Amino acid sequence: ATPSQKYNSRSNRGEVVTSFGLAQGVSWSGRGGAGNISLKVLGCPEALTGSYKSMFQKLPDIREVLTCKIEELGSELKEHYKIEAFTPLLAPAQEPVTLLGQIGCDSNGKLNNKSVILEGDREHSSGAQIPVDLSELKEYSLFPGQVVIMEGINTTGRKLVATKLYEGVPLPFYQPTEEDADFEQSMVLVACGPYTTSDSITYDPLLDLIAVINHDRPDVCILFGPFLDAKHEQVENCLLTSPFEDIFKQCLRTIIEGTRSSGSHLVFVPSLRDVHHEPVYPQPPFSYSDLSREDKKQVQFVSEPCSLSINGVIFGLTSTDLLFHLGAEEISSSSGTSDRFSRILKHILTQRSYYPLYPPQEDMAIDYESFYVYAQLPVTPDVLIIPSELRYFVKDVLGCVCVNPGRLTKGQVGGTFARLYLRRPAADGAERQSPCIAVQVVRI
């Protein structure tokens, strides 16, 4: 009765909340399943094929993963900046020297400029830690887990005073092939969970999302979690009469028989809030066997996170609220006129990983053994899809279009989804040319 009343009582459906690129009207519509559509997994061994390996972490095994994460980025930045050599943290030096390490905190509280420490690599500093002083630094932006090269003075061997901080160097963009330049207009619709209001189980946001999909006739439909939110009050009260395993089947078949007429490809990517699935980051692709021959050609299961090439465009698909992972525990030197979401996006793009944060917050499980092999950037993705609880925004950072449509439903107030245009322009030109000219985030 009272549940889902607020969702039905709103009458402000239709208006666009933000747009990026070129001005477009309301009649967004494509050819659907017509033409050639290429959805290929690219990068490392593809998005991990099996479920996983184990939940048993040998303590002396995470150290090698951390060492590789530090050393690869350090060596790449050394080659880029043409630095002669690095210096150990514990080696005193009156002359200015360059240090290689990772930013971290010396306590369990919120990181501040006074408590920033640098933890060195095992090859050079043998895993030492020294506090750093940022007073003599003009501009900086530091979060725990960031791998940078720090220029400074360390005279007493117990504190390093900054003089200059090197900027992160992102990996070069993907090189388009001649085959990718012969394709036509492509549409990518993106929606993120939850798909219901925070007090009802009618799944009406899912229903009218399916209706919007049917009316739009898009080409690709990327659906992020949580399809079954781990914070929904009825989930933890075990008041339901059906197992979440079966709740998964009805949620799947809802979209399956709702989007048959549209004919658009479906890419379902799980989220860490999926209570029914394995709580491991990265998360394996979903398992589902009740798929017909027609459905298998339209339904594709992709793990989380992953880098998927859609029509020759590398979309970075991740369900973690990485913006809230990073910006909530990051410090900066300028606060008057500075763009926050852009600097977190740049930091994400420059650290060459899907989750640079080390350590993470209290509640999220990561298995470090496969973190090194399934959470890195093969190439810099052309479009980033990063849902967040914060405000929706589409911005161009480092020549890359990052899209944050947010949640489809936000408690008792509606959220937003996004739709993106993509084509491949002429290969010749001024090098960088964003394939995704137009993005439009509209509230459901």
């Binding site: 390996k53 939940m55 303590l59 995470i62 030492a128 075990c238 979440f244 350590p359 509640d363 499980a365």
Partner: protein, 133 residues
């Protein structure tokens, strides 16, 4: 359905607790509890950052997690619960009075709910390459 669902929440809570990564100092005087894993390692393992002479130990060892999972598997494993009886007559009496094929199917459903987590992700797998090479 409710029993399996509650088992699901309980096992999720346990696995998240394990992956929390809490470490405790072995020294009774220190009792240092930190979430950040230091890179200063001793022969036994990690070295406490508060006191310089001690070894940090995981708060929730893998043995505890495996024992808890085995306990959850065993409390709903009627197959090994029926063979534990020393007399076949009592086993048959208990099987034919309540352990109907539907009851056995429900017990096997709980056992398979546990076995889905116990099947691929594990601890019972021993890599020979790491052991020899």
């Amino acid at each position: 359905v409710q029993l399996s669902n509650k088992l699901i929440m309980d096992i999720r809570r346990f696995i998240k607790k394990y992956y929390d990564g809490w470490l405790i100092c072995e020294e009774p005087t220190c009792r240092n509890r930190t979430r950040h894993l230091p890179l200063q390692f001793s022969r036994t393992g990690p070295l406490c950052p508060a006191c310089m002479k001690a070894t940090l130990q995981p708060e929730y060892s893998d043995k505890s997690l495996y024992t808890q999972l085995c306990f959850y598997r065993y409390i709903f494993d009627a197959e090994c619960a029926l063979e534990k009886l020393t007399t076949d007559h009592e086993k048959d009496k208990l099987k034919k009075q309540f352990f109907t094929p539907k009851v056995l199917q429900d017990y096997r459903k709980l056992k398979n709910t546990a076995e889905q987590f116990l099947s691929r992700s594990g601890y019972s797998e021993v890599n020979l390459s790491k052991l020899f090479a």
